[PDB]
């Protein structure tokens, strides 16, 4: 869908969460959808609060 | 062909054990010479005396008895 091609820069993530995802080579919404909540928690220095922030951002884009 | 295969599997799980432990086990079952040795021969050959090799043997077996690092051999029975 056009929302799944959105670059993660438009997710308005925190600079910490954004830099951790970008360090994990996650570049598209499809890539992030390829990770589970557990896989998100396995991301180095990604915390529960940052996963909640990502969930809220995804809900912001539906 | 079921003899060469077995030893390899056994040797692998033995490698996981500490050097002293595996040596103790090999000597207490005669895996090299076919002759089981007592405590006392390893008591003299090895550094510490008798009543020490028994503890090493038990502390090795308890490691092997765990479901990890040894589960293939269960089918050999």
């Amino acid at each position: 869908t056009p929302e799944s091609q959105t670059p993660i820069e438009d997710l308005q993530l925190s600079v910490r969460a954004y830099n951790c995802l970008k360090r994990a080579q996650v570049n598209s919404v499809a890539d992030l959808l390829s990770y589970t909540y557990e896989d998100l928690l396995e991301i180095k220095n990604f915390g529960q609060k940052s996963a909640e922030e990502v969930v809220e951002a995804l809900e912001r884009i539906g | 062909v079921a003899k060469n295969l077995l030893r390899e599997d056994l040797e692998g799980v033995l490698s996981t054990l500490s050097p002293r432990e595996r040596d103790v086990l090999r000597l207490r079952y005669g895996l090299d010479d076919g002759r089981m040795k007592t405590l006392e021969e390893i008591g003299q050959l090895f550094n510490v005396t008798r009543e020490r090799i028994r503890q090493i043997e038990a502390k090795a077996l308890r490691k092997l008895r765990h479901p990890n690092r040894n589960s293939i051999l269960k089918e050999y029975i």
């Binding site: - | 054990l17 550094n47 503890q55 690092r69």
Partner: protein, 232 residues
Amino acid sequence: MKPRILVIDDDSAILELVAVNLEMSGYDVRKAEDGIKGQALAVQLVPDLIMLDLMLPRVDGFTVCQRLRRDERTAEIPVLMLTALGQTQDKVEGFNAGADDYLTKPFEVEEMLARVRALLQRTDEILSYGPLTLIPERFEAIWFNRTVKLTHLEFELLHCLLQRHGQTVAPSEILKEVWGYDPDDDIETIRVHIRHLRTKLEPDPRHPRYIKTVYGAGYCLELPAETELHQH
């Protein structure tokens, strides 16, 4: 196999003492009463070690050692020369004989056996430190002057830490050594047992002095040197 030792000495009493002591230590001993027979036996048997007298009749021990070093079959066999140490000339000639070590007569049997052990370790546990002594047969620790009973896992954990005294041991290493488990198994169990050790060993378990936690690295056993026991 049992290591083979060739003893060459014209003193039948010294030769017998050495042979008996080596056999009690589990070695296969061969004996020769003269340098010619000794050399022939060395050539025939290729022993794992030669112990060689100095004052053999007809052929001095230095010539014997040089001939052993000249024969490709014996050139690599270690030679422990026994010497009465009394003249600088025998020293200067030993400096050319190719001996691997010297043992002064009279010698302690334990020193001889130590040299033999080192040579054999070349061809191919901490039970006490400062205030801690391990008693394996009873799974007990002497801690300063008090006896502390340990469980099997508490004892093995304390032993693992003592083996690496002053170094930080990683939780994966503890799992591998004590439990034999995969590095990826739950390390939380270790966290429990370390606490028991502290409860048994520290004066205040909340401020552990000896069994330190190195955050992100593991646990370290730091023991005072024997010179400091009077202050603790």
